[PDB]
Amino acid sequence: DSCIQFTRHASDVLLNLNRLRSRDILTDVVIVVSREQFRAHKTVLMACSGLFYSIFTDQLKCNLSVINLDPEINPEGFCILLDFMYTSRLNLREGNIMAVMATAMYLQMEHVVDTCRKFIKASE
Amino acid sequence: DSCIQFTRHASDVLLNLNRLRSRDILTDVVIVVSREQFRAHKTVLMACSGLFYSIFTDQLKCNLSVINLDPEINPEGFCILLDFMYTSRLNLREGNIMAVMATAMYLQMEHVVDTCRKFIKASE
């Protein structure tokens, strides 16, 4: 087509979605991790994670207001990944890299799994 | 902080939100324009438009599944703006620029209003 494109549009949209999350506006699901609860928007979770995409396209699960993650999932690793989904920023540290990678593998967040693998290979 | 950032994350999120819109997945509102109906996600509309932000933060309107726009709003101008919200791409043409600018002013989409003003000033 002959469209023009606003370079900062996608980043501005994500920033506003994160502001709605912070203020708990239109959040439609609670993710339960080892008795730690995280409120979010189903559509953002689906846009970022192959696991949430599969969960919320399921005819029965699409209607659930609570999702319980596998007990092996670490709440801090989840929290870091949830922050990444809404900001593009990943708080990756020596002390959390193993939990973050295991959580990203479970959530099916391929780009996060890739950078964790590379950061681990650099330390060996 | 000491975060790393994935450059393409925001664009990938928006692309996936547009794919959900195309497949009518988790759309939670119908926008009615001169008897033309557009399905969308309330959160994306709020992230892009000052008007939708004000509508869906209102305690009564946040719960509506149908929103009727002012009868002066042109469906094509709305359609072009809805596409912009989900893609960052604006199909701005000599034949639609007046309708697009009037719709962007009503929807409170300041960056769109700005480029329309500039494109009109160049033609005078």
Binding site: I4, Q5, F6, T7 | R89, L90, T115
Partner: peptide, 4 residues
């Protein structure tokens, strides 16, 4: 704004 840019030409994509």
């Amino acid at each position: 704004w840019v030409i994509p």
